[PDB]
A paper describes a structure:
To determine an atomic-level understanding of S-coatomer interactions, we attempted co-crystallization of αWD40 with either wild-type (1267Gly-Val-Lys-Leu-His-Tyr-Thr1273) or clientized (1267Gly-Val-Lys-Leu-His-Tyr-Glu1273) S tail heptapeptides. The β‘WD40 co-crystal structures with the wild-type and clientized Thr127Glu S heptapeptides were determined to a resolution of 1.4 Å. Overall, these two crystal structures reveal substantial similarity (Cα RMSD = 0.2 Å). The S tail heptapeptides are intercalated between two stacked β‘WD40 domains. The S tail extended motif makes contact with the binding site residues in one of the two β‘WD40 domains whereas the upstream tail residues interact with the other β‘WD40 domain, but at the face distal from the binding site. Overall, the two heptapeptides occupy the canonical WD40 binding site, which provides electrostatic complementarity to the dibasic motif residues, Lys1269 and His1271. C The β‘WD40 surface provides electrostatic complementarity to the S dibasic motif and the C-terminus.
Hence, this loss of critical proteins has the potential to compromise ER proteostasis and generate cellular stress. This challenge to normal metabolism is overcome by the activity of the cytosolic coatomer protein I (COPI) polymer, whose repeating unit is the coatomer, a 560 kDa complex of seven distinct gene products (α-, β-, β′-, γ-, δ-, ε-, and ζ-COPI)25–31. Overall, the coatomer functions to retrieve the escaped “client” proteins, such as type I membrane proteins, from cis-Golgi back to ER by retrograde trafficking. In particular, the S protein – a type I membrane protein – is delivered to the ERGIC from both the ER (by anterograde trafficking) and the Golgi (by retrograde trafficking)3,10–12. Here we utilize recombinant SARS-CoV-2 S proteins and tail peptides, including constructs with enhanced mimicry of the coatomer binding motif (clientized S protein), to elucidate the atomic structure of the S-coatomer interface.
Author numbering:
A (entry chain A): 1 to 301
B (entry chain C): 302 to 307
């Protein structure tokens, strides 16, 4: 595939902190600093549903398509779940005594992870009345990002301002390992490469770097430099051999995942970039990113 | 102070 980037749909809004694609409907969820969340059909450019969830920032939001839900987490410390077909608020609970930074949904089991400024990751089971099933303790600063290993989702990674990534096993109380990233301003984001040929993870930092890691040896494979302010995220695209990052410098960058050289820098004109999603099935090679002044959905080729 | 307040 040749990079042939086309704007599918962009709209302005208050600052977009969380973003996610629905796997079967042509929908994107955005969660805003204002407490509002929006679901857009990016093919028809019509709003599916929107909710004023809270007056505090909503930093995290994901679809749970197999239950017809969205799950959101906000600076009022609460996790809320809504049925996107009816609008029903399914559950509303205090999850942590501090801000929620990140939510991840297990691909097959009824588990959600939340990472918080309270220094923990918590595991919630929606088949057990959203019970707290485990708290993962060990980090020493805000937990900014949680992600399951898609190839072994009995494990997951947490990225933390304490400058480490910890990889954990469900049901065990200490990390399988702690990765010292050398990203001395902390880790804002962690993501897994999805395919079985490389055991890779990627981290993004306020220190302006993105680092690729072999999680079997713990070695740094590569450091990607070029962003000029905090790097909010960096991810492997699920189908294309590229990495996509975004920054408070207002740019998205696309990097070759083999040579680690930048291939494209985009300034979509929405000021600082905060969040990313990739369409899981590679439908049209869609990506979406949220910014200070709205969001954009792009087809990469 | 809250770091990463924005």
């Amino acid at each position: 595939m040749k990079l042939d980037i086309k704007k599918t749909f962009s709209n302005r809004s208050d600052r977009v902190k969380g973003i996610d694609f629905h796997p079967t409907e042509p929908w994107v969820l955005t969660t805003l600093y204002s407490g509002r969340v929006e679901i857009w059909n990016y093919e028809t450019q019509v709003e599916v549903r929107s909710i004023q969830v809270t007056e505090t920032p909503v930093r995290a939001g994901k679809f749970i398509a197999r239950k017809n839900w969205i799950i959101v987490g906000s600076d009022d410390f609460r996790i809320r779940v809504f049925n996107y077909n009816t609008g029903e608020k399914v559950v509303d609970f205090e999850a942590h005594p501090d801000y929620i930074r990140s939510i991840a949904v297990h691909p097959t089991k009824p588990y959600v992870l939340s990472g918080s400024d309270d220094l923990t990751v918590k595991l919630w089971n929606w088949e057990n009345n959203w019970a707290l099933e485990q708290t993962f303790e060990g980090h020493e600063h805000f937990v900014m990002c949680v992600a399951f290993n898609p190839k072994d989702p009995s494990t997951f990674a947490s990225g933390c301002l304490d400058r480490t990534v910890k990889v954990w096993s469900l049901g065990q109380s200490t990390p399988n390992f702690t990765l010292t990233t050398g990203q001395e301003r902390g880790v804002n984001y962690v993501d897994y490469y999805p395919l079985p040929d490389k055991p890779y993870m990627i981290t993004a930092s306020d220190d302006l770097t993105i680092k690729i890691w072999d999680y079997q040896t713990k070695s740094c494979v590569a450091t990607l430099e070029g962003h000029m302010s905090n790097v909010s995220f960096a991810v492997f695209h699920p189908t294309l051999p590229i990495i996509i990052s975004g920054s408070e410098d207002g740019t998205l960058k696309i990097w070759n995942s083999s040579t680690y050289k930048v291939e494209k820098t985009l300034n979509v004109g929405l000021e600082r970039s905060w969040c990313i999603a990739t369409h899981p099935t590679g439908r049209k090679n869609y990506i979406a990113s949220g910014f200070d002044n709205g969001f954009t959905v792009l087809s990469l080729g | 102070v809250k770091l990463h307040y924005t």
